[model samples]
Target: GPGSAAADDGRRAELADRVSRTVADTIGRPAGSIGGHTSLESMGLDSVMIRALASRLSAEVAPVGPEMLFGLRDLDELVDHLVAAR
Candidate 1:
């Protein structure tokens, strides 16, 4: 059980780093500015931006559906969803 938990932690960290880079590129922000706990909504990114984000992330990892993106609460949750999708 703990082994799986630790594996998940490692996976999430890696995924989060990638997602953070994608988000930074998408939003034209510094990578360091994109914290995992921040709500994307707070960033004021519109629907088009979110779609582009999903596209980039989908290419990087699995297919990140718009419905899934809208449903997530934060970057960390997005990583968790991506991990689960895998």
Candidate 2:
């Protein structure tokens, strides 16, 4: 129990990578192209693409809505929210 936070941190990092990689795949970009601070909207993702991204992410990681995804700042924040939701 003492190291729970530490362990959680590790998991968070892993999840962040996974989330970013998925986004990269969705956008037809390399994983390295996606960064935590980069806004998904900046990638020219339309509403349809946003839903697709949300669908893929929700299936692979956690359930999330396009609205919530749009509400988030960036990939890092989304991963943080997912970790807490998990």
Candidate 3:
């Protein structure tokens, strides 16, 4: 059970890292500069970019479709939702 839990944590972290890096790079920012609480809009994302992000993430991360990106309040929540979904 412990091993399974640890493995799940590792998977979560890896998925989070991959997804987060993808977003930060697309937005032309460093991954570390992007915070869990930071708003994407404040970081320069518009509705068009948000839809594009959701489209890309459908294959890269989750079943995330259009509107998912703009609907989420923060990054960490989205990451956790994907982790749980998978």
Candidate 4:
């Protein structure tokens, strides 16, 4: 299972990067400024940005409900959502 584990790790990393970039771009910030540990509130993300992120996630990744986005506050939380969905 080592190869599968490595692939999964790469997938998670790619997902994290994509989600980070989407969130940062939606909030009018540079992706380099976003840290996996930072909360959306700390990044000055407004309702519009949050909605946009939800939309993108829904379209690109999974069918995330509106309530899910409301409850999540950061990249790590978002990745957890993805993991849980599977």
Candidate 5:
């Protein structure tokens, strides 16, 4: 079970990284060294990319409500929320 949890953590990190990179790349920038503290707004993310990221993350984690994106401020917060929901 320990190994499984570790694997899950790794997978979560990788998935989150991919999501962040996709958002960043879509806007023609680097990944922005994102973490729990990086605000998506400061990173220049637009609505389209946010929706894309939300859809992709929901498919990987759980189904996020349409309103959740508007409430979220950054990737860290979103990831934390998803992990908490799980």
Candidate 6:
């Protein structure tokens, strides 16, 4: 019973946690140490890392790419973007 911008009632922001976990797992850094408002740039991510995250996010959330992002400020923004994309 959720709602999205596209009238898709399946919107969810659960990917905030997923992105944090994926960031950690992808780099063998660790998990949950990241917070929802933490800027993704804190991970020192390059285009490659951003691309990797985008791929996973696209598969799980909406269809997105690194081109749709820009150091995005924080995970919550990404979550919001994904929710809206649906």
Each candidate: RMSD to true structure? 2.5, 3.2, 3.6, 3.5, 4.8, 4.7
User: Could you give candidate 3's per-residue lDDT for residues 25-69 as a string of tens digits?
Assistant: 668888888765677767788877787778767778887876667
lDDT of each: 0.84, 0.81, 0.74, 0.73, 0.65, 0.69
lDDT of 4 by residue, 26-63 (tens): 77888899876788788876677667778887766665
lDDT of 2 by residue, 1-86 (tens): 66655656677887888788778878888888888789867776678878888998888878888998777777878888888878
The better candidate by TM-score, 2 or 6, is: 2
Measured on C-alpha atoms, candidate 2 has an lDDT of 0.81
**For model 6, what is the C-alpha lDDT against the true structure?**
0.69
**Poorly placed runs, candidate 3 (over 4 Å):** 1-12
Worst 10 residues of 4 by lDDT: 4-13
Candidate 1 local lDDT, residue 9: 85
| Pairs with backbone N, CA or C atoms under 3 Å apart (clashes), candidate 4 | none
Question: Which has the higher lDDT value, candidate number 2 or candidate number 6?
Answer: 2
Q: What is the lDDT ranking, best to worst? A: 1, 2, 3, 4, 6, 5
Each prediction's TM-score against the native?
0.83, 0.80, 0.71, 0.72, 0.56, 0.70
**What's model 5's lDDT at 61?**
61
Per-residue alpha-carbon lDDT of model 1 for 5-73, expressed as tens digits? Answer: 556588898788989888889899889888889898876667888889899999986678777787778
Model 2 weakest lDDT span, ten residues long: 1-10
| TM match of model 4 to true structure | 0.72
Sort the predicted structures by TM-score, highest score first: 1, 2, 4, 3, 6, 5
Off by over 4 Å in 1: 1-7
Total clashes for model 5 = 0
RMSD versus native structure for model 5: 4.8
Clashing pairs in 6: none
After superposition, candidate 6 runs with Cα above 4 Å error: 1-13
How many residue pairs collide in each prediction?
0, 0, 0, 0, 0, 0
With a 3 Å backbone cut-off (N, CA, C), the pairs that clash in candidate 1 are none
